[PDB]
Amino acid sequence: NPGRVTNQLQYLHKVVMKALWKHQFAWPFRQPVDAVKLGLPDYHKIIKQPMDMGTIKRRLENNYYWAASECMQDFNTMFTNCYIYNKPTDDIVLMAQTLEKIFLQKVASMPQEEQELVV
Numbered sequence: 001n002p003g004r005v006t007n008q009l010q011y012l013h014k015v016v017m018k019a020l021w022k023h024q025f026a027w028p029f030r031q032p033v034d035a036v037k038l039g040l041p042d043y044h045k046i047i048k049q050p051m052d053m054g055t056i057k058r059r060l061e062n063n064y065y066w067a068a069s070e071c072m073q074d075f076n077t078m079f080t081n082c083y084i085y086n087k088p089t090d091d092i093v094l095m096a097q098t099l100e101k102i103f104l105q106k107v108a109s110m111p112q113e114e115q116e117l118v119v
């Protein structure tokens with residue numbers, strides 16, 4: 001019993017996740033950072049909690065979260081990892097920023113009170 005179905009979590013899956021997934025800047029974030037593929041032997045030394053959209057999607061779809069706040073924290077971790085690891089002038093930082101602005105816009109219109117759904 002890791003989590004529940006709530007109104008806010010279904011909103012995050014349908015409105016937030018689907019929208020970010022399809023975005024033209026989403027491709028670097030759809031799978032975990034592969035440090036071997038990218039030749040970044042220090043990545044896991046700097047970033048201790050990797051996160052990506054694929055993992056968040058799996059967690060949503062397998063009812064992993066108990067509350068929407070937990071899912072929002074995973075999105076935040078994905079973005080913050082990017083800002084912390086990469087150089088300020090790297091394009092990936094601008095791509096993360098673009099996606100995160102959309103995330104915040106959609107979160108501002110999330111259903112206000114979280115209620116467990118009968119399923």
Ligand SMILES: CC(=O)N1c2ccc(-c3ccc(C(=O)O)cc3)cc2[C@H](Nc2ccc(Cl)cc2)C[C@@H]1C
Pocket residue numbers: 027028029033034038040081082085086091092
């Ligand atoms: C998110 C993040 O912080 N980073 C990240 C993660 C995944 C991939 C990546 C993913 C898939 C492919 C691919 O399928 O070819 C290539 C690169 C790349 C990066 C970033 N590198 C990168 C991004 C865009 C371009 Cl045009 C060139 C290099 C580095 C960073 C660790």
